[PDB]
RNA sequence: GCCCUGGGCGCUCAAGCGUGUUACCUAUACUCUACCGUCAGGGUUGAUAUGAUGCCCUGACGAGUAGGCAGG
RNA sequence: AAGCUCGUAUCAGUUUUAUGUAAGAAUGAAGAGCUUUUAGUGGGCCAUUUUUGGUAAGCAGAACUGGCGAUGCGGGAUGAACCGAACGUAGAGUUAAGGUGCCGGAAUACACGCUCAAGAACAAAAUAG
RNA sequence: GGAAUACUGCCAGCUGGGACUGAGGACUGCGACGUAAGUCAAGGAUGCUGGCAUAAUGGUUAUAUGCCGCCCGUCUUGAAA
C-alpha cells in the first residue's frame, strides 16, 4: 500500500478485456431437468432453478426427492432435457454467489432447502411419474448412442 | 465511387450481352488485361530459363 | 461390444475372413472361429490344390483346416512382435463347434460371405476337401460328430419355438389393453 | 399399381391417388417398423423412463399369465 | 441401478504414424457406435480417460487414470484423434478407454 | 459430369476475306476451358486454322430440352486407335444427351480403352420411332410391358458382425 | 508501382486439396497447371 | 480391348484392368504462431529508473566437402 | 579482404519489335564498375544429341546441354541415375509424389464394361464395331 | 403463361461445435459505440473457481511397449564397394 517498491518490477499494460455476462445456450431454461455428469451427485437428476452471477447454475434436486441440496454447478457438466417445470412459484432471489461461500450444516441453509422443496414438490407432483423420474438415477445401457439420444 | 463504378460496369456488361443476344448478333467480351500467377512446382530441378 | 465373438466359418472366404479377424483382434477384440472345415475359397478344385504345394515344396506344414486358416491369419499380423504375439493369443480355431461354444450364439461377417462376394455361376473350393486331399485324416469324424451336433439341437430349437409360442400368446392376450396401447404410442 | 408407360407427373399423381398407394404402404409391416424406429429415435429421456415403467407393469402381468 | 456407466466405451488403435515414422503425441481412438465423421463430431472436445489397475498403492485408491481430450476426426470410418497430457505407453493398443460426456453441448 | 457447349469462330477476319465461314460445332466438356481447347484442336485437325489465328466468338451452355423424357440417340463416333482411324456408329438409350455421351465415353474407355483425347463426337441425333434402332441391346428395352427381376441383391451391412445370416432375396 | 509495392503473396496449400490426382498436368486435361481462368479464383480462395 | 496357349499375407460383381466422380494420411514441402543467431535499416542525452562495447523496434535469412572469416 | 566514385540508368542463363548493334519496349534487383592480392580448384559417373557410321554384333571413337560430386527428408519391398522436395528448435493447420483388405494411417467408396488364367522387352507372326 | 428449383459466383450476412496459440508489459497511434460524460472485440489473457507442506509435482535409472537406426576413422572412385 505505502511501501515503495524495493525492486522495480515492471507494471502490467492496460489489458483491454472487459468482463461480459455468460451467454448460456438456449437449451438451458429455468425449470429444466438436468443430469449431472460428474461430482458427488454424478448421474442424479436435478432441476434448474436460477442462474448465478459466477457463471454457475443454482440448482436443486429437489433435496427431498433425491437428496441433492442447493449447490452450484457448471453448465458444461450438465445435460438439459426437454421437460421443464414451472419454477415461477419458487423464490430464488435470496440465493446469490456469496450465499455459497464456504468461509454441522448451517440451520439457515436447511431452512432455505426445506422452503424450496416445499414449493417445488407441489409442482413436481402435478404431473405423473415426475417424482419417480427424478428419483431414478440416469445411466447408460448397451447399444446407447449419446450422439443419437434426444435428451 | 469505386463501388458505384464496379456496379455500373457489371450492369452495362450484362445489358450489352443481353442486347447482343436479342439483336441476333455476337458480343465479343473485352479481353482480360490482368492475370494472377501462382508457383506450383518447387525449386528443385527447375530448368535454367 | 461383445466380450467374446464366435464366428461361423462356413460360407466365408478365407482371405476376407482372415483379414477382418486380424483387424478386429488387433484392436483387442477376442474372436473364436468354428466350423473352419466348412470355410470356402474361390475357384474350382484346381488352382486351389495348386498354390499350396508350390509353397509347400520349400519348415513345417499343417494339414488341418484350422491350421491353414491360422497361417492365413498369421501372415496378416505382424508376428515376431509382442503386439502380434499378444493379438494371436486372442484367437481360437476349431473344426466344427466343440463345446462350450456349441451352447452360445455364433455370428457371421456379411462382408466376407461367399454368397455376397462371389458372382453366381463360379466354382469355389471348400477347406475340408482340400485338407483331405492334402492329407487330413479327421474329415470323417468331423462330419460325423457335426451331424450329431445338429441332432437334438433341432429338438432344442423346437422346444424354444414352442416356448416362444406361449410367450407370444401371453403377449397377445395382454395386448390391446390400456398399458399396451400406451407402450405402443411411445414406439414400444 | 397400374400406370401407363412414360406417364407424366400429373398422370402419375392421379394413378397414385386412385390406387391408394399411401394406404397400402401404411398397412405393410415395413412402414410400421420404420415408424416405430423413428419414434424410438425421437423418444425423450423422460419418455424412455415412462416406457421402462410401462414395460415393467406389462411384464408383471405377462409373467403371471404363463406358468398357470 | 444395474449399470453405472456414464461414458461411451472406446478402443485405442494406434498413434498417428507414417510407414516408418510414428507420432506418439497424437493417439487414435475408436468410439463404439461411431462409423462416420459426422457422428464423431459430437465427441470432439469430450474428456477421454484411460483406466488401469496399479500394483503399488496410490494417494487413496488402487486405480490410476490418464486424462485426455478429443481434437479432430480421423479417416472415414469414424476414427477420432485424441491427445493426453501424458502419452499412452503404446502398450494399450486395443485397450479400453472411457469417453466422458462432459463438456456437454446439449 | 459433362456439359454441352456451342463454340463458333471466324479465324480472325482480315482484309480481302470479310465474314469468314464461321465454323460451328457442339463441343462436350466438363468446363468452358476444356471445351475451348477441344474446339481449337478440332479446328486445327480438320481446318487450316490455328489457335493463334482464331477467335472464340461466343460460348453458351446448351441444356437438353426434356431432361425427363426417355429417348434414344444415334451417335456417329469417330476416334483414333492404335492403327489409323475408324469411324464408328453406336446407339445409346438415355434420358438426356449429356448422360448418353458420358455412357458412350465410358464404353469407349472400357470396350476400346480410348480416352477423351482420341474420341471425337461428330454428331448425336435423337431417335424416337421404333424399328429405326439397329443394335439388339437397345431393342432389348423396347418391348411392350417389359418386366425383369433383380435376383441376388447384395445389400450392404454397415456392421461387421451380423447374426441374421442374411438372404439375397428381393 | 502498386504491383511492385505489394510483397509477393505467401499463400498456404488449398484447404480442400488440389482435386486432380496429379498436379503436374495441363488443366485442360485434368491437371493443375495451365490456364484455369474461371477456376483461378476458387483455387486462390482455397489456398488463401 | 481382354483371357490360356506364342514385398508377404493375400483377392475374383477383385482387394486384378481402363476410364469417370467424391472422403482421408502424411515430408524437414507451404500459412500462422513460440524461441536462438546472421544480415540490413532505424530509435536512443541539457544523459538512460542496467557497461552508447549499453537498452531496444522492424524484415528476411539459417544445407554443405576443401577453403576463408568471427565468437567462445 | 581492403581504397575511389556512384546509387544511380548498372545489369539480366527472361521475353518481344527493328536492322537478314536501336527501342522516351515488358518484368526484377538500384547491391555495380574501377585497381592491389589470397586459400582451395586441372578426379569424374550417366540421359540426350551433336554425330564419324553402322554389321553377326556391338557400340570403337566421341560429344551438346543437363542429374550428382559435398545432399539430407517423404514414397518407391532395398538401391547413385525414379517422383516430390532440398535442412535453425516446437505447436496448430494444408499438401506432393505414394496410397486407403491386414502388416500400414486412411473409403472391403460410388458408376460403367472387361478377364478364369494369371493379373496386379524379349521368345509377337497368327466382347463392340 | 407464369412460378420456382437445378448449377456458377457475391454477401465489408447471421449463427454454433472442435484443436493449438496468451507472445508484448504504466499512456502516446489508427478506429467504433454515444448530443456529451464515458465505454469498446480498437498496435498480444482478463476475472472467478478447484488441490497443497507426512504437499501438489518434478527428477535419475532397469525392463517393457509402437517405429526407426548395416561398425568406427583413412584412401581408392564418378559410386556403393
Contact E40, E34 (CB under 8 A): yes
- DSSP H helices, chain B, are 2-22
Strands F119-127, F71-80: pairing kind: antiparallel
Nearest nt (C1') to C19 (CA)?
I102
Peptide bond preceding B10 in cis form (omega within 30 of 0): no
Q: Which CATH architecture has domain E1-106?
A: Beta Barrel (2.40)
Task: Measure, in angstroms, how far nucleotide J15 C1' is from residue A24 CA.
Answer: 14
Are the beta carbons of E48 and E82 closer than 8 angstroms? Answer: yes
Å from B16 to nearest chain G CA? 21
Tell me how far apart the 2 most distant CA atoms of chain E are, in Å.
48
Strand H interface, C 43-82, C-beta < 7 A: 43, 55, 71-76
Under 8 Å between Cβ of F75 and F121: yes
What the block records as the C-alpha cell of F20 is 469468314
C-alpha cell recorded at residue D61: 402381468
A150 and D42 within 8 Å at the Cβ level: the answer is yes
Is the shortest CB-to-strand distance from G4 to strand H under 7 Å?
Answer: no
- Per DSSP bridges, beta strands E47-53 and E7-17 are unpaired
Assign A39 to helix, strand or coil.
coil
Contacts of A11 (CB under 8 A, 6+ apart): none
Q: How was it solved? A: cryo-EM
Contact status, residue F10 vs residue F19, Cβ threshold 8 Å = yes
What gap in Å lies between CA C188 and CA C178, rounded to an integer? 13
Rounded Cα–Cα distance for residues D49 and A141 (Å): 13
* Residues C54, C131 within the same domain: yes
Q: Does residue C93 sit in helix, strand or coil? A: strand
State the Cα–Cα distance between residues A101 and A94, nearest whole angstrom.
Answer: 14
- Calculate ∠ Cα D61-D34-D59, nearest 5°: 10
3-state DSSP call for residue F88?
Answer: strand
Same domain, C153 and C69: no
Question: Around Cβ B40, how many Cβ atoms within 10 Å?
Answer: 13
In angstroms, the CA E86 to CA C24 distance is 27
**Residue F125's beta-bridge partner residues?**
F74
C124 with C187, same domain: the answer is no
Distance between CA atoms of residues E4 and E96, nearest Å: 17
Cell numbers at residue C134, please? Answer: 492334402
Q: Is the CB of E20 under 7 A from strand J?
A: yes
Strand H reaches within 7 A of the F125 CB: no
Element (H, E) at A46: strand A45-51
Between the alpha carbon of residue C35 and those of residues C19, C66, C71, the distances in Å are 18, 9, 16
How many residues are given for chain F? 170
Judging by beta carbons within 10 Å of its beta carbon (0-12, 13-18, 19+), is residue C17 exposed, middle or buried? buried
DSSP string, D20-58: THHHHHHHSHHHHHHHHHHHHHT--HHHHHHHHHHHHHH
Chain F residues whose CB is inside 8 A of the G37 CB are 33
Residue C57's DSSP bridge partners are: none
B22 at G interface, C-beta within 8 A: no
Q: Cα angle at G34 between G28 and G35, to 5 degrees?
A: 80
**Residue C42 sits in the same domain as residue C123:** yes
Q: Round to whole Å and give the CA distance between C87 and C27.
A: 8
Distance between CA atoms of residues F90 and F85, nearest Å:
16
CA D25 to chain CA mean position, Å? 9
* Beta bridge partners of residue F120, listed in sequence order: F78
CB within 8 Å: E13 and C83: no
Residue in chain C closest to E29 (alpha carbons) equals C27
Smallest CA–CA distance, residue G30 to chain B, in Å, is 15
Q: Going by C-beta distance under 8 Å and a sequence separation of 6 or more, which residues neighbour residue F98?
A: F1, F2, F3, F4, F28, F64
Q: How many whole angstroms separate alpha carbon C143 and alpha carbon C95?
A: 9
For residue F90, the surrounding DSSP H or E stretch is: strand F85-94
Q: How far is CA F156 from CA C19, C109, F166, G37, in A?
A: 18, 11, 10, 43
Which CATH number applies to F68-144: 3.10.20.10, 3.50.50.60, 2.60.120.380, 3.40.1010.10?
3.10.20.10
Q: Please check whether residues C174 and C187 belong to one and the same domain.
A: yes
The DSSP letter of residue A98 is G
Best mutation target among C27, C31, C77, C111 (most E Cβ atoms within 10 Å) is C27
CA distances C51 to C15, C43, C44, Å, are: 14, 12, 13
How far apart CA G21 and CA G42 sit, in angstroms, is 18
Paired strand residues for A45 = A35
Cell of A56: 454457475
CA separation for the pair D35, D39 (Å, rounded): 6
- In the block, cell 477467335 appears at F55
What span, in angstroms and rounded, lies between the C-alpha atoms of F170 and F155?
10
Pick out residues 33-92 of chain E having their CB under 7 A from any atom of nucleic acid strand I.
71-72, 74-77, 79, 83
CATH code that applies to domain F1-67: 3.10.20.10
Name the strands in the sheet holding C30-34, side by side, starting at the edge strand that comes first in the sequence. C4-8, C30-34, C91-93
Residue G34 · residue G26 · CB < 8 Å: yes
Distance of CA A84 to the CA centre of its chain: 14
Total Cβ atoms within 10 A of residue C97: 21
The CA–CA distances, whole Å, from E41 to A108, E36, E45, E80, E97 equal 46, 9, 9, 9, 18
Q: How far apart are CA A30 and CA D66, in angstroms?
A: 48
Interface touch G38/F33, C-beta < 8 Å: yes
C89: three-class secondary structure by DSSP: coil
Nucleotide nearest to G16 (CA to C1'): I94
Q: After which residues is chain C broken (C to N over 2.5 A)?
A: 58
Indicate if CB(E59) is under 7 A from strand J: yes
If you write DSSP's letter for every residue of C101-159 in order, what string do you get? GGGS--BB-GGGBHHHHSPSS--EEEHHHHHHHTT---HHHHHHHHHHHHTTHHHHHHH
Among candidates B36, B40, B41 on the partner chain, residue whose Cβ is nearest the Cβ of G44: B36
Interface size between B and G, measured as CB pairs under 8 A:
11
* C-alpha to C-alpha distance for A137 and F148, rounded to whole angstroms: 57
Q: Which residues of D44-66 are buried (b: 16+ CB within 10 A; e: fewer)?
A: bbbbbbbbebbeeebeeebeeee
Exposed (0-12), middle (13-18) or buried (19+): which is F56, by Cβ within 10 Å? Answer: middle
Would you tell me how many other CB atoms lie within 10 Å of the CB of residue D20?
A: 12
Which CATH number characterizes residue C44's domain?
Answer: 3.90.1180.10
The number of C-alpha atoms within 13 Å of C172 and in the hemisphere containing its C-beta is 6
Q: How far apart are CA E104 and CA A79, in angstroms?
A: 6
Domain chopping of chain F, boundaries? 1-67, 68-144
Nucleotides of J under 7 A from a protein CB: 8-10, 12, 16-20, 22, 24-27, 39-42, 44-50, 56, 64-69
CB atoms under 10 Å from CB of A69, counted, come to: 17
> What are the extents of the domains in chain A?
1-151
Distance from CA of C134 to the nearest CA of E (A): 37
Chains contacting A (3 or more CB pairs within 8 Å): D, E
- What grid cell was written down for B44? 528443385
Asked if C174 and D62 touch (Cβ cutoff 8 Å), the reply is yes
- Enumerate the domain spans of chain E: 1-106
User: CA-nearest residue of chain E to A145?
Assistant: E33
Domain identity same for C48 and C95: yes
Whether the Cβ atoms of residue C129 and residue C48 lie closer than 8 Å to each other: no
SS (H, E, C) chain E: CCCCCCEEEEEEEEEEECCCCEEEEEEEEEECCCCCHHHHHCCCCCEEEEEEECCCCCCCCCEEEEEEEEEEEECCCCEEEEEECCCCCCCCCCCEEEEECCCCCC
Q: What is the CATH number of the domain that holds C162?
A: 1.20.5.4280
Q: How far apart are CA C32 and CA C98, in angstroms?
A: 11
Q: Which set of grid coordinates corresponds to residue D13?
A: 399423381
Degrees to nearest 5, angle at CA F159 with F156 and F164: 75
- Is-contact F154 F168, C-beta < 8 A? yes
Closest CA to C101 of C4, C1, C2, C3: C4
Resolution in A: 3.3
Give the Cα separation of B39 and G10 in Å (integer): 10
Measured CA B40 to C1' I11 distance, in angstroms = 29
Which domain range does residue C175 map to? 139-188
Chain E residues in contact with A141 (beta carbon < 8 A): 3
Measure the CA dihedral A123/A127/A132/A135, to 10°. -30
Count of domains in chain C?
Answer: 2
- How far is C-alpha F17 from the chain's CA centre? 35
Q: Does residue C94 share a domain with residue C62? A: yes
Name residues 2-41 of chain D within 8 A of C (Cβ). 35-40
Going by the DSSP 8-state scheme, the letter that residue F114 receives in this structure is -
Rounded Cα gap, residues F79 and F121, in angstroms: 8
CA distance A137 to A148: 20
Residues C146 and C121 grouped into a single domain: no
D2 three-state secondary structure: coil
Q: Cβ A146–E42 below 8 Å, yes or no?
A: yes
Round to whole Å and give the CA distance between F60 and B27: 12
The residue written with cell numbers 427381376 in the block is: F149
Amino acid at each position: 500500500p505505502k511501501w515503495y517498491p524495493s525492486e522495480d518490477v515492471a507494471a502490467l499494460k492496460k489489458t483491454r478485456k472487459a468482463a461480459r455476462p455468460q451467454k448460456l445456450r438456449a437449451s438451458l431454461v429455468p425449470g429444466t431437468v438436468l443430469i449431472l455428469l460428474a461430482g458427488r451427485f454424478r448421474g442424479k437428476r436435478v432441476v434448474y432453478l436460477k442462474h448465478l452471477e459466477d457463471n454457475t447454475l443454482l440448482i436443486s434436486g429437489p433435496f427431498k426427492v433425491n437428496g441433492v441440496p442447493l449447490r452450484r454447478v457448471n453448465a458444461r457438466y450438465v445435460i438439459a432435457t426437454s421437460t421443464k417445470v414451472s419454477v415461477e412459484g419458487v423464490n430464488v432471489e435470496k440465493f446469490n454467489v456469496e450465499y455459497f461461500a464456504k468461509e454441522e450444516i448451517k440451520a439457515e441453509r436447511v431452512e432455505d432447502q426445506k422452503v424450496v422443496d416445499k414449493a417445488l414438490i407441489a409442482e413436481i407432483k402435478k404431473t405423473p411419474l415426475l417424482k419417480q423420474y427424478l428419483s431414478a438415477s440416469f445411466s447408460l445401457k448397451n447399444g446407447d448412442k449419446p450422439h443419437m439420444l434426444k435428451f | 465511387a469505386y463501388q458505384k463504378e464496379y456496379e455500373t460496369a457489371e450492369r452495362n456488361i450484362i445489358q450489352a450481352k443481353r442486347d447482343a443476344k436479342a439483336a441476333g448478333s455476337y458480343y465479343v467480351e473485352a479481353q482480360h488485361k490482368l492475370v494472377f500467377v501462382v508457383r506450383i512446382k518447387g525449386i528443385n530441378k527447375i530448368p535454367p530459363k | 461390444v461383445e466380450p467374446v465373438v464366435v464366428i461361423d466359418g462356413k460360407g466365408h472366404l478365407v482371405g476376407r475372413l482372415a483379414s477382418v479377424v486380424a483387424k478386429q483382434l488387433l484392436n483387442g477384440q477376442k474372436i473364436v472361429v468354428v466350423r473352419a472345415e466348412e470355410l470356402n475359397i474361390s475357384g474350382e478344385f484346381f488352382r486351389n490344390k495348386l498354390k499350396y504345394h508350390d509353397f509347400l515344396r520349400k519348415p513345417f506344414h499343417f494339414r488341418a483346416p484350422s491350421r491353414i486358416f491360422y497361417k492365413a491369419l498369421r501372415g496378416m499380423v505382424s508376428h515376431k512382435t509382442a503386439r502380434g504375439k499378444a493379438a494371436l493369443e486372442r484367437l481360437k480355431v476349431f473344426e466344427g463347434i466343440p463345446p462350450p461354444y456349441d451352447k452360445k450364439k455364433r455370428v457371421v461377417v456379411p462382408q466376407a460371405l461367399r454368397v455376397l462376394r462371389l458372382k453366381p455361376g463360379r466354382k469355389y473350393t471348400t477347406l475340408g476337401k482340400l485338407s483331405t486331399s492334402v492329407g487330413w485324416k479327421y474329415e470323417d469324424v468331423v462330419a460325423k460328430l457335426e451331424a450329431k451336433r445338429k441332432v437334438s439341437s433341432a429338438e432344442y430349437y423346437a422346444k424354444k419355438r414352442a416356448f416362444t409360442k406361449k410367450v407370444a400368446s401371453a403377449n397377445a392376450t395382454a395386448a390391446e389393453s390400456d398399458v399396451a396401447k400406451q407402450l405402443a404410442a411411445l414406439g414400444y | 399399381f397400374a400406370l401407363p408407360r412414360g406417364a407424366r407427373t400429373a398422370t402419375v399423381s392421379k394413378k397414385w391417388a386412385a390406387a391408394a398407394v399411401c394406404e397400402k404402404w401404411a398397412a405393410s409391416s415395413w412402414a410400421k417398423k420404420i415408424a416405430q424406429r423413428e419414434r424410438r429415435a425421437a423418444l425423450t429421456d423422460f419418455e424412455r423412463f415412462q416406457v421402462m415403467v410401462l414395460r415393467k407393469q406389462k411384464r408383471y402381468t405377462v409373467k403371471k399369465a404363463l406358468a398357470k | 441401478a444395474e449399470s453405472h456407466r456414464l461414458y461411451v466405451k472406446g478402443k485405442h488403435l494406434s498413434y498417428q504414424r507414417s510407414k516408418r515414422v510414428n507420432n506418439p503425441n497424437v493417439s487414435l481412438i475408436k468410439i463404439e457406435g461411431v462409423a462416420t465423421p459426422q457422428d464423431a463430431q459430437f465427441y470432439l472436445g469430450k474428456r477421454i480417460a484411460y483406466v488401469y489397475r496399479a500394483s503399488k498403492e496410490v494417494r487413496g485408491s488402487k486405480i490410476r487414470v490418464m486424462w485426455g481430450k478429443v481434437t479432430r476426426t480421423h479417416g472415414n470410418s469414424g476414427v477420432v484423434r485424441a491427445t493426453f497430457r501424458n502419452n499412452l505407453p503404446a502398450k494399450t493398443f486395443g485397450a479400453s478407454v472411457r469417453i466422458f460426456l462432459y463438456p456437454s453441448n446439449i | 459430369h459433362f456439359k454441352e457447349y456451342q463454340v463458333i469462330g471466324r479465324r480472325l477476319p482480315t482484309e480481302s476475306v470479310p465474314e469468314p465461314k464461321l465454323f460451328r460445332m457442339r463441343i462436350f466438356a466438363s468446363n468452358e476451358v476444356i471445351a475451348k481447347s477441344r474446339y481449337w484442336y478440332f479446328l486445327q485437325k480438320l481446318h487450316k486454322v490455328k489457335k493463334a489465328s482464331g477467335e472464340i466468338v461466343s460460348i453458351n451452355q446448351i441444356n437438353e430440352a426434356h431432361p425427363t423424357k426417355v429417348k434414344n440417340f444415334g451417335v456417329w463416333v469417330r476416334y483414333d486407335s492404335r492403327s489409323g482411324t475408324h469411324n464408328m456408329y453406336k446407339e445409346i438409350r438415355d434420358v438426356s444427351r449429356v448422360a448418353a455421351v458420358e455412357t458412350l465415353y465410358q464404353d469407349m474407355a472400357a470396350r476400346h480403352r480410348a480416352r477423351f483425347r482420341s474420341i471425337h463426337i461428330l454428331k448425336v441425333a435423337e431417335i424416337e420411332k421404333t424399328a429405326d434402332v439397329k443394335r439388339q441391346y437397345v431393342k432389348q428395352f423396347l418391348t411392350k410391358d417389359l418386366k425383369f427381376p433383380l435376383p441376388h441383391r447384395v445389400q450392404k451391412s454397415t456392421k461387421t458382425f451380423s447374426y441374421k445370416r442374411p438372404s439375397t432375396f428381393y | 508501382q502498386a504491383n511492385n509495392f505489394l510483397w509477393p503473396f505467401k499463400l498456404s496449400n488449398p484447404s480442400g486439396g488440389w482435386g486432380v490426382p496429379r498436379k503436374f498436368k495441363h488443366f485442360i486435361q485434368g491437371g493443375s497447371f495451365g490456364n484455369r481462368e474461371e477456376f483461378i479464383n476458387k483455387l486462390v480462395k482455397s489456398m488463401n
